[PDB]
Amino acid sequence: HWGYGKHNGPEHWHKDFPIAKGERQSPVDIDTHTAKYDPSLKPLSVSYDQATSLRILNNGHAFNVEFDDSQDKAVLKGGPLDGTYRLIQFHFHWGSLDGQGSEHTVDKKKYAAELHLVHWNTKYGDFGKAVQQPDGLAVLGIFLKVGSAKPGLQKVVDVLDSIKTKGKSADFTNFDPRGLLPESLDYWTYPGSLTTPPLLECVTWIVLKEPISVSSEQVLKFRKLNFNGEGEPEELMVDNWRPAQPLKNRQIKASFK
């Protein structure tokens, strides 16, 4: 089944998921000189004050922090978006070393990791119906660089020892995702896809320009997770990123001059 190894990683995914070679795949390199400021972009709105986190899960690829999405409680609106998108989960992608780990790149620069806050368009009623639509999802992407610790990340770091292996989960109520955001909401946006199988082309990507800083110790704890299940030989969960894909017929727009 799919993964990030030499035998089942990004170069193999197209055999089971032919849209891997599609017209609107993610991630991409963001060429900052080619991106164009778009004055049509409405102000972006991240409204997370009522977020209700539930659980953290090691799914064998990354770890997901899941939210209650039964009601408009944590939502993304504005920017390139029409309507309202509800937060369902966040997760990260990261490297074995600090010089790689992000999925998107900025003028070919790779960051140490990348946070994805995944949201679905409430006009489609459920996440499963949203992923049958070209405007079903919005993913807010945030780069991580190593420097000072991110206080709002530490509760995530500290629970990882309890979800070391694939299939393990833990309660993760009362987590505030506002603590993962940088100061600025300046962003780039383009139409793309999920970056893991099934690679569905449903996503409006919103990638923040400002990275957050996390400490070396925080990212080192990500790298102690395991891809494998309990009782199986240890496979460190590192380098769970897809590289940049062809831009094809797309324009990346900037929210900032």
| Known binding positions for substrate | 195-196
Q: Are strands 75-79 and 113-121 parallel, antiparallel or unpaired?
A: unpaired
> Are 179 and 114 contacting, i.e. CB atoms less than 8 angstroms apart?
no
Instruction: Kindly state the tokens that stand for 128.
Output: 């499963």
If the CB atoms of residues 8 and 174 are measured against Zn ion, the closer one turns out to be 8
Q: Which residues of 67-101 are buried (b: 16+ CB within 10 A; e: fewer)?
A: bbbeeebbbbbbbbbeebbbbbbbbbbbbeebebb
> Are 99 and 238 contacting, i.e. CB atoms less than 8 angstroms apart?
no
Instruction: Compute how many residues bind ligand 0VY; rule: CB under 6 A.
Output: 6
Amino acid at 136: G
Instruction: Compute how many residues bind Zn ion; rule: CB under 5 A.
Output: 1
Active site residues: 61
Pick the piece of the chain touching ligand 0VY (CB under 6 A) from 68-76, 176-184, 192-200, 221-229: 192-200
If the CB atoms of residues 81 and 113 are measured against Zn ion, the closer one turns out to be 113
Interactions with ligand 0VY, residue window 94-153 (CB under 6 A): 116, 118, 139
Q: Does 81 bind ligand 0VY (CB under 6 A)?
A: no
Amino acid at 129: K
Q: Does 24 bind ligand 0VY (CB under 6 A)?
A: no
Interactions with ligand 0VY, residue window 228-257 (CB under 6 A): none
Q: Which residues of 146-159 are buried (b: 16+ CB within 10 A; e: fewer)?
A: beeebeebbbbbeb
Residues at the binding site for Zn(2+) are: 91, 93, 116
Out of ligand 0VY, Zn ion, none, what residue 226 binds, judged by CB under 5 to 8 A for its kind, is none
> Cis peptide before 134, with omega less than 30 degrees from 0?
no
Among 30, 113, 160, 194, binds ligand 0VY (CB under 6 A): 194
Pattern of binders to Zn ion over 105-124, x per CB under 5 A? -----------x--------
Among 165, 195, 226, 245, binds ligand 0VY (CB under 6 A): 195
> Are 102 and 114 contacting, i.e. CB atoms less than 8 angstroms apart?
yes
The footprint of ligand 0VY (CB under 6 A) covers 116, 118, 139, 194-196
